[PDB]
């Protein structure tokens, strides 16, 4: 799992565009979007795969707001009593642990997120890389 994504960032050619840290952040985003399909519940699942130390540990956001629709991510503006949360906003839980990071749709959305983010990053790089020469004769 974690080792797999480490092998990714090793095989990632544009390691400057995405070194291990932001690689694993984008992969946590992909894992949340995958949990979006694993559960009909639309919950923001931060994971924090522990980029280099060990494997992942899924969490569950609380999306602090006075609402209760989709209660997987609903907490009022002071509900931090149990768990010693003590935080009004930002207090997010780790109730569900060890989702799937190896199945078909997981790896498919991993591919999609990887190619999307890599292409976006290379675009944003070349933009400034050529903007450097603003005021010169360029081909085209």
């Amino acid at each position: 799992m974690n080792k797999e994504i480490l092998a990714v960032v090793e095989a990632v050619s544009n390691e400057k565009a995405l070194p291990r840290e932001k690689i694993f952040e984008a992969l946590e985003s992909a894992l949340a979007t995958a949990t979006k399909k694993k559960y009909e519940q639309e919950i923001d699942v931060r994971v924090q795969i522990d980029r280099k130390s060990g494997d992942f540990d899924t969490f569950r956001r609380w999306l602090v707001v006075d609402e209760v629709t989709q209660p997987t991510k609903e907490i009022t503006l002071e509900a931090a009593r149990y768990e010693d949360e003590s935080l009004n906003l930002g207090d997010y839980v780790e109730d569900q642990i060890e989702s799937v990071t190896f199945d078909r749709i997981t790896t498919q959305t991993a591919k999609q997120v990887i190619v999307q983010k890599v292409r976006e990053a290379e675009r944003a790089m070349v933009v400034d890389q050529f903007r450097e020469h603003e005021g010169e004769i360029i081909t085209g």
């Binding site: 797999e4 092998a7 591919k111 990887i114």
Partner: protein, 100 residues
């Protein structure tokens, strides 16, 4: 690409994959009905990307999650009943399956 009979199907929900076993075939006794999935098969769908920088990704990190397509054998619409037997003819060289 080759054809595999894996248990997972990229799109369908849990119901359509509940009858199968861990290998991807229904148990002997599941009272299926027209529409359900007997197998259990996926195919290499896509073609012509030609980006080896992504082929190296999906050769180890997406080795079997590249070009899925659910050309899986469903019971024809209308015919219900009970599954009573499953034969599996495997071409030699092709290794094996658990049900086999």
């Amino acid at each position: 690409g080759p054809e595999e009979i894996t248990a997972d199907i990229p799109n369908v929900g849990e119901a359509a994959l509940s009858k199968l076993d861990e290998s991807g075939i229904v148990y002997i006794g599941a009272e299926v009905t027209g529409g359900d999935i007997l197998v259990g098969k996926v195919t290499p769908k896509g073609e012509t990307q030609l980006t080896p920088e992504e082929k190296l990704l999906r050769a180890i990190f997406g080795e079997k999650a590249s070009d899925v397509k659910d050309s899986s054998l469903r019971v024809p619409n209308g015919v219900s009943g009970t599954v009573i037997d499953v034969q599996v003819f495997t071409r030699d060289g092709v290794e094996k399956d658990k049900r086999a």
